[PDB]
Amino acid sequence: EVQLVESGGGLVQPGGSLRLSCAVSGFPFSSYWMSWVRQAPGKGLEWVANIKEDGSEKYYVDSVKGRFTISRDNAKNSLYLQMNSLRAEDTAVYYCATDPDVGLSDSWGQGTLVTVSSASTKGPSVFPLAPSSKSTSGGTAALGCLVKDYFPEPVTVSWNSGALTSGVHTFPAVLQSSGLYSLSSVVTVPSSSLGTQTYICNVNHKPSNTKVDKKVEPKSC
Amino acid sequence: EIVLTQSPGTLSLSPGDRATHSCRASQSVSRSYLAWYQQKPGQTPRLFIYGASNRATGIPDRFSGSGSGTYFTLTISRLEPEDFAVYYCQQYDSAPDTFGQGTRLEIKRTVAAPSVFIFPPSDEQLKSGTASVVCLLNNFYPREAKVQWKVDNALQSGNSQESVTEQDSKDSTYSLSSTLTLSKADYEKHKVYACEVTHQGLSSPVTKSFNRGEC
Ligand SMILES: N[C@@H]1[C@@H](O)[C@H](O)[C@@H](CO)O[C@H]1O
Ligand SMILES: [Cl-]
């Protein structure tokens, strides 16, 4: 199977640098042009740079010329982006991206978010959104977790370690005035289950190495 | 640089409809090295068409591409509910390998009113000086909805934020969260917390409310 796995992103000070790595397998990497493409939050895709299969020719968007360098290690089936003198305009998800002539739909990596900010990493506070008479009709109650005041993106939320899947809605994070993010994750479940079944949201904020499990307790009269 | 302009910016069509996405180049694209990508919200783009008219691996027959020179199209011959995305064209004949600005395709469905739920602040959160009050609008269509917060009957401005999920891949609905943020102090100044929802699917607006401190 085709896999392209980026690493090396995250939070970085303005004026600082990051080294992005991308490990590729499942197709003949060393025979293709490769590229980096980025996407600033809420914006479109923007081509950043590309490189010939043997590394001997490469191109860059003018906004990064002289401070970003694309390179590859064909022996290690890997692609790199060395990024210097970073600015807020560089904040984006960075994707390694195969030349489209490869003709494979799954030819880009998962992406790594780069956040150019002077702020510290900060883990979320996780609060229950408790099921009550105000979130329950028919045989279904809504409950959730409020994942509040973290930085930077992203967080992941699961329910019951991934066993609970249907009826889940994890909302896009919103940036508060404070400069911290907040998000809710909710789920609708059977009302009958509420006495018997435990509902636990599993929150992971890798940037701060914060993991929280919060059990969400019902309200009854 | 070759500049790619996509049209329309936004497109809303039902399952079974034919969708057409246009990509115009400021100069001719040699070798028809013109690609199309599908991007779902918050996910990696997938390559759908390369060389103007070739389907990528795993791409179903309902997706096709055509064109040459300065005019290209991506067609979805028969829409399926899982086909909502932003679609981007890209030229890769000569660097910079620029992208168009994208067409956002929404899948249209019949009107669906939201179910409305309200969640007071947790005692945990209250310990720490802030109160978040959450209103959930679940499984509705179209996306446009108005949420108005009222505390002891006065409507709020500037202290709430909303977020919307991507469309459901089977039933094409949205959900929306609206969070009202008050200082724990200011929370205590008032009693009735209400979320009032206006939506095309509701015959009249719906209010969901609680009194500060109840079951
Ligand atoms: N300048 C082009 C690149 O931008 C292109 O993607 C690659 C494959 O066409 O070949 C180079 O000659
Ligand atoms: Cl671009």
Side-chain angles (χ1 to χ4, degrees), chain A residues 126-200:
Chain A
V126 180
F127 305 121
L129 293 164
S132 76
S133 74
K134 283 285 158 48
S135 63
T136 318
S137 220
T140 73
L143 57 100
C145 284
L146 174 65
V147 180
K148 192 177 201 295
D149 290 342
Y150 62 90
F151 189 78
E153 283 268 70
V155 296
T156 68
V157 185
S158 56
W159 285 95
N160 294 352
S161 307
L164 180 47
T165 247
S166 57
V168 177
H169 293 293
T170 302
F171 290 90
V174 302
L175 186 56
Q176 302 167 118
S177 318
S178 58
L180 307 179
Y181 291 94
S182 180
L183 151 174
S184 270
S185 177
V186 302
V187 58
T188 58
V189 307
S191 295
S192 72
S193 65
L194 288 180
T196 48
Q197 186 67 73
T198 312
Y199 293 98
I200 300 184

Side-chain angles (χ1 to χ4, degrees), chain A residues 30-33 51-58 72 74:
Chain A
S30 69
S31 71
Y32 281 97
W33 283 71
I51 190 168
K52 187 163 158 61
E53 70 285 339
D54 68 356
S56 66
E57 193 189 343
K58 58 217 75 166
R72 64 198 299 156
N74 286 342

Side-chain angles (χ1 to χ4, degrees), chain A residues 6-81:
Chain A
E6 298 103 330
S7 60
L11 180 66
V12 60
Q13 285 280 157
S17 61
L18 291 172
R19 176 195 76 182
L20 305 192
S21 302
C22 172
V24 179
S25 62
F27 80 89
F29 171 81
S30 69
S31 71
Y32 281 97
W33 283 71
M34 294 292 303
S35 75
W36 291 94
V37 173
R38 72 184 174 180
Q39 183 168 47
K43 303 302 194 174
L45 299 174
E46 180 179 41
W47 182 88
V48 176
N50 69 353
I51 190 168
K52 187 163 158 61
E53 70 285 339
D54 68 356
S56 66
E57 193 189 343
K58 58 217 75 166
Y59 299 98
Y60 297 94
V61 73
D62 279 316
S63 59
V64 309
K65 280 180 199 187
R67 62 193 182 100
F68 288 17
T69 301
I70 189 175
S71 61
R72 64 198 299 156
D73 186 333
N74 286 342
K76 305 206 358 168
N77 292 112
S78 298
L79 183 71
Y80 303 90
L81 191 67

Side-chain angles (χ1 to χ4, degrees), chain B residues 68-189:
Chain B
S68 63
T70 58
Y71 184 71
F72 304 82
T73 58
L74 169 74
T75 299
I76 314 174
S77 58
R78 188 204 68 254
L79 280 169
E80 293 285 352
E82 60 263 39
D83 292 345
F84 75 84
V86 181
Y87 292 89
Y88 293 92
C89 59
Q90 187 197 21
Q91 69 88 17
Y92 58 102
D93 181 72
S94 73
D97 293 0
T98 51
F99 292 84
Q101 79 281 8
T103 295
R104 182 181 169 276
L105 173 67
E106 179 200 59
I107 300 303
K108 184 169 293 200
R109 57 155 292 133
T110 59
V111 67
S115 294
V116 181
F117 305 111
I118 194 169
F119 301 89
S122 65
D123 283 339
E124 292 103 296
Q125 186 185 21
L126 286 175
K127 276 204 301 294
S128 59
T130 297
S132 299
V133 189
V134 172
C135 189
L136 169 60
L137 281 59
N138 221 18
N139 302 327
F140 63 87
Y141 184 92
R143 194 171 177 286
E144 293 64 35
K146 165 168 44 150
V147 180
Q148 276 264 23
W149 284 100
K150 296 201 274 286
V151 192
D152 284 335
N153 301 309
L155 66 105
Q156 308 294 288
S157 326
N159 52 356
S160 66
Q161 299 187 288
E162 285 182 354
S163 168
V164 190
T165 60
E166 67 171 18
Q167 280 191 284
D168 188 280
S169 64
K170 290 143 90 81
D171 79 6
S172 301
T173 62
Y174 297 98
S175 297
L176 178 158
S177 69
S178 175
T179 303
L180 177 75
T181 294
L182 306 186
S183 68
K184 177 208 150 159
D186 287 22
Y187 182 64
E188 301 176 358
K189 228 287 273 167

